[PDB]
Every structure is written in C-alpha cells, then in structure tokens.
Amino acid sequence: GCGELVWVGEPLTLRTAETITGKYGVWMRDPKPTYPYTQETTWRIDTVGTDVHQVFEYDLISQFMQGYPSKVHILPRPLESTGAVVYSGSLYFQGAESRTVIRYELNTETVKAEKEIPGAGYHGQFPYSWGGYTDIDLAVDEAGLWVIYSTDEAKGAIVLSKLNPENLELEQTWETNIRKQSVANAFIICGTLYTVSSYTSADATVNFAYDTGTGISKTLTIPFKNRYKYSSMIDYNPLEKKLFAWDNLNMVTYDIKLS
Ligand SMILES: [Ca+2]
Ligand code: NA
C-alpha cells in the first residue's frame, strides 16, 4: 500500500528516558524480523556522549514501554549519532569519527560487513540543522536499505544511495538540491525522500520531497509537531507505516497517511 505522504498524526510518547544520556538517541524495530526477533522486538540506543556502545533490546513492546531490556548488546566499536537502523536481523550504524557503516548481526553479535560511504562528509560537515554529528542517516523503506548523506561535490545537498544490505555496496545514487544542514531530519517512504523543516517547532512541516523514480523535487506543507522541542532522530518504518522519532528524552511515534 504505497503512495505519497499526505498527512502526519500527533506524536505519541511511548517511553521517556530517565537520564541525560537519553536526551537524544535512536530507537528502532525491524521491518523484516528474523528469528529470534519478532515485530515487537525494539532496540534503543541513548546517544549522548563520546563512547556510545550500549544497545538495549526489548523482546516485547510491554518491556520497551514499561520495563527493563531483555538483553544489552555491547557494540565492538563506538557508534556515531542517531542515524542507525535495524534491518533483517542486523543493526546498521556509523562508526564514531568515521564515514564507515557497519552491519552488526544482532543474534550472533558479529560484524558482517563494513563500508566507507564514498566521499561522505562526517563528524559535523553535513549534519542536519541541530548538529549532533548527524551527517549520515540510514533509512529503510518498502524497497530495502538506503543511506542519506552529502559530499563536497554535492556542496552539502542531500545525496541518497540504495545499499545492498548484505555487503553494503552502493547500488544507485541520487543527488537532490536540498541543503542537508537546512533541514531537521529526513526519511524515505516508497522511494521518495521527505524532509522536516524544524526540530524545535510545534508547528513544523514536512517541507520537501524528492521522488527517486522521477527525479522531481517538490515543496510540501504537511504539519509536523515536535512535542518536546528537540527532535534528534526521525525515521520511517515501512512495516508499521509510521514515523519513529526521538524528541528531547521521549521516544515517540507518528501515524501517517499515504495516497
Ligand atoms: Ca532519518
Ligand atoms: Na536513520
């Protein structure tokens, strides 16, 4: 059931972090779960600080919302920023102070692939507008795995590449005209990249779209509310067809409607 994004609902708070380590972070579910995980399995990474390596895993939504993790993974190398995703049994994350994407198989705690994103800026060159070293943002949509970034050659405009999820090879690349540091975050739905105008405003918008099928860029005015005024992470989950976000200690989700 694919289509163009036409509406975003009110943010729903699922969990509020209890320490400043959780002011910003990423939380994720797998749109292609694999044993021993299910559609309920939830991963959470608080990303404040300089040696981020703990991943909280919750077998059940009840545990994610009301209780303790069922497992803590200690990543073998530290992680950068809020851009990570989980896809088909692996956490895909960026190595701290690097342009390297790492595929970490969760059930075996094994690194399966590492890839330098060619020419990608990193560590504060092309972050989203809030900073936070958000230069590299992974994404999953109905067609699989992508990475959102920029390069000097693109002069800071958003570049997106489709990734092979097994070995991280780039399969195809598109260059937009949207300055990455001028938008708060971005995500991909049904092959279209969407951006959010502000990470602070209760009256933000989903303000730009780039359709990878046609190469056409559009301006949009879809209301988007940052309930807690500091959104560090905004991603799309194509199985649930919802936005997942992290907003000033709060793990939130937004319903959407496609046309
Ligand atoms: Ca994102
Ligand atoms: Na992401």
Numbering used by the authors: 244 to 502
What do the authors of the reporting publication say about this deposited model?
Inherited missense mutations in the myocilin (MYOC) gene, within its olfactomedin (OLF) domain, constitute the strongest genetic link to primary open-angle glaucoma via a toxic gain of function, and thus MYOC is an attractive precision-medicine target. Myocilin has no known function, and there is no glaucoma phenotype in Myoc knockout mice or in individuals with a homozygous N-terminal truncation mutation or hemizygous deletion of MYOC, but rare non-synonymous coding mutations lead to toxic intracellular sequestration of misfolded myocilin. However, not all mutations in MYOC cause glaucoma, and common variants are expected to be neutral polymorphisms. Among the common features associated with pathogenic myocilin misfolding, we demonstrate that a single metric, OLF thermal stability, can robustly segregate benign from early-onset disease variants.
Overall, nine variants (T256M, R296H, L303I, S313F, V329M, S331L, E352K, A427T, and V499I) were considered likely to be benign. Assessment of spent media from cells expressing each of the 16 full-length myocilin variants revealed WT-like secretion for T256M, R296H, L303I, S313F, V329M, S331L, T353I, A445V, V449I and K500R. Structural integrity was further confirmed by high-resolution crystal structures, which were solved for 11 OLF variants. No gross changes from WT OLF were detected for the structures of T293K, R296H, L303I, V329M, S331L, E352K, T353I, K398R, A445V, V449I or K500R, indicating that these mutations are accommodated within the native five-bladed β-propeller fold and do not perturb the dinuclear calcium-containing site. Interestingly, R296H has one loop comprising residues 261-266 that was difficult to model, perhaps because H296 is smaller and adopts two conformations. In addition to the five variants that we predicted initially to be benign (T293K, T353I, K398R, A445V and K500R), our study reveals seven more (T256M, R296H, L303I, V329M, S331L, E352K and V499I) that are indistinguishable from WT OLF across multiple assays. Thus, our data indicate these should also be considered benign.
